[PDB]
Design a protein around this ligand. Structure first.
Ligand SMILES: [K+]
Ligand SMILES: [Zn+2]
Ligand SMILES: [Zn+2]
Length: 233
């Protein structure tokens, strides 16, 4: 199985997993992006939009993306209610076992995870694990501090690639993201949610050298607009 992973700055990603395009917290137009919304829409196919929580830095350009592409959303129940009432089409879920998304693509599932953070009045914040044929490929942590159930995610699923926030202040710092990496058992970690604004300034290369000197995993510091392909067998 093949995962083509594009980073757009902040916590915005496009995950292509065997010819289905899944966007997560798609603030394409964040301050560090090198991609306009026009560029994104020409260059990526969007089949699903994952929203981890309701902060605007994460919802981002979701609504316009969904209007222009026809893509459905995937999100926690409260956000599903708010967006369904606003006229959008999507799948709602909650924290637990994966949702079966066969209609989107055969064998695809996504589970919502805990996250120690906030989400205005729109339910609770989440992370998201993308499965194919029962295997956890990508865990996008949303915004979060440490959460003890990260250990269960490691043990039960060991998602291959972990997208983890490292900027501090509003989320785990580097130090906490290190412990998280240990708990979650990724093969590779892409750091996110850093440098966009002063309170979240952190050095992703500092993160890298500590995770790797600990032999905890490989860290792929991505650049806004960069794509990287991963195979796991
Ligand atoms: K915004
Ligand atoms: Zn947030
Ligand atoms: Zn955020």
């Amino acid at each position: 199985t093949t995962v083509k992973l594009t980073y757009f700055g902040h916590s915005a990603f496009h995950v292509e997993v065997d010819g289905v395009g899944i966007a997560i917290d798609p603030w394409i137009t964040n301050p560090l992006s090198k991609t306009t919304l026009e560029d994104y829409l020409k260059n990526f196919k969007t089949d699903l939009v994952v929203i981890t929580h309701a902060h605007e830095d994460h919802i981002g350009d979701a609504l316009e993306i969904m209007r222009r592409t026809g893509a459905k959303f995937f999100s926690i129940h409260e956000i599903y209610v708010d967006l369904t009432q606003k006229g959008f089409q999507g799948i709602g879920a909650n924290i637990g076992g994966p949702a079966k998304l066969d209609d989107v693509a055969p064998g695809l599932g996504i589970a919502l995870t805990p996250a120690t953070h906030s989400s205005y009045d729109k339910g609770v914040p989440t992370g998201a694990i993308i499965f194919k044929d029962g295997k956890a490929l990508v865990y996008h942590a949303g915004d979060t501090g440490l959460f003890a159930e990260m250990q269960f995610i490691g043990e039960l699923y060991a998602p291959k690639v972990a997208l983890l926030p490292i900027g501090g202040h509003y989320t785990m710092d580097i130090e906490q993201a290190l412990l998280a990496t240990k708990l979650l058992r990724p093969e590779v970690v892409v750091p996110m949610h850093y440098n966009t604004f002063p309170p979240i300034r952190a050095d992703p290369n500092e993160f890298k050298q500590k995770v790797e000197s600990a032999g905890l995993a490989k860290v792929r510091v991505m650049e806004p607009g960069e794509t990287v392909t991963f195979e796991f067998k």
